[PDB]
Every structure is written in structure tokens, then in C-alpha cells.
Design a protein. Structure first.
Length: 124
């Protein structure tokens, strides 16, 4: 079984680029990060900053999570991110995603020792 921290890395980390290259970035990334294996993950955000920078958020602004839990943190600075969301023409096994690049604050849920990101809650 994949650890929560490892799952967060696979789903939400892409430090290899400064920002979404093209409109096909999401189709490519959602497939390579295995998020279209048995079904198309409807929504997924990828962060284009170093793993260290994202992990550091767990020691930044403590804020409420959408679900009410209090283990969420909002990055002090904005970060390059890409939101990947299924389009209307998307239908397994032919997943299709819209790529939306943005520079905003990220909010992640943290847990464990080390205290690292285990969920991507939202971006602001």
C-alpha cells in the first residue's frame, strides 16, 4: 500500500517544470502519474515548486480545511500550479483534461512524523 505522503507526491508534485507547457500537459501528466488507470480522476492539482518548498508549507499558516479538520496549512507565498479537470468529451478509457495554469497559494493537510503533506485541499 502506498503511504499517504507518497500518494500526495505522486498526485500533486511536478518540480520538473516551472509551469504547464501546453494545453496537453494534463492529459500527459494525469496518465503518467497513473491517475487514469481504472478510471479518470475528475480533478487534480499539480504544484510546480520543489518538494522542499511544498513540504515547508506544513509549518506555515495553519488554517481550517474544507472538511472542518484543523491540520491544513496555507502557503505564505504563491506557487506555480496547474489544475487538471476532466472536460465534457472525457470518458474512460479515453480521459480528456483541461489544463489551467495559475500562481496562487496552496492549502494542504499535513500529518505524521515527519509532518508532511498528505492531502491537497485547495488553492487561493
Amino acid at each position: 500500500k502506498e503511504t499517504a505522503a507518497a500518494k500526495f507526491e505522486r498526485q500533486h508534485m511536478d518540480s520538473s517544470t516551472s509551469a504547464a507547457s501546453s494545453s496537453n500537459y494534463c492529459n500527459q501528466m494525469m496518465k503518467s502519474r497513473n491517475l487514469t488507470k481504472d478510471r479518470c480522476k475528475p480533478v487534480n492539482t499539480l504544484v510546480h515548486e520543489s518538494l522542499a518548498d511544498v513540504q515547508a508549507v506544513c509549518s506555515q499558516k495553519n488554517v481550517a480545511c474544507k472538511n472542518g479538520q484543523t491540520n491544513c496549512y496555507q502557503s505564505y507565498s504563491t506557487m506555480s500550479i496547474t489544475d487538471c479537470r476532466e472536460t465534457g468529451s472525457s470518458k474512460y478509457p479515453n480521459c480528456a483534461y483541461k489544463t489551467t495554469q495559475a500562481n496562487k497559494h496552496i492549502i494542504v493537510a499535513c500529518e505524521g512524523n515527519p509532518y508532511v503533506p498528505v492531502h491537497f485541499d485547495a488553492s487561493v
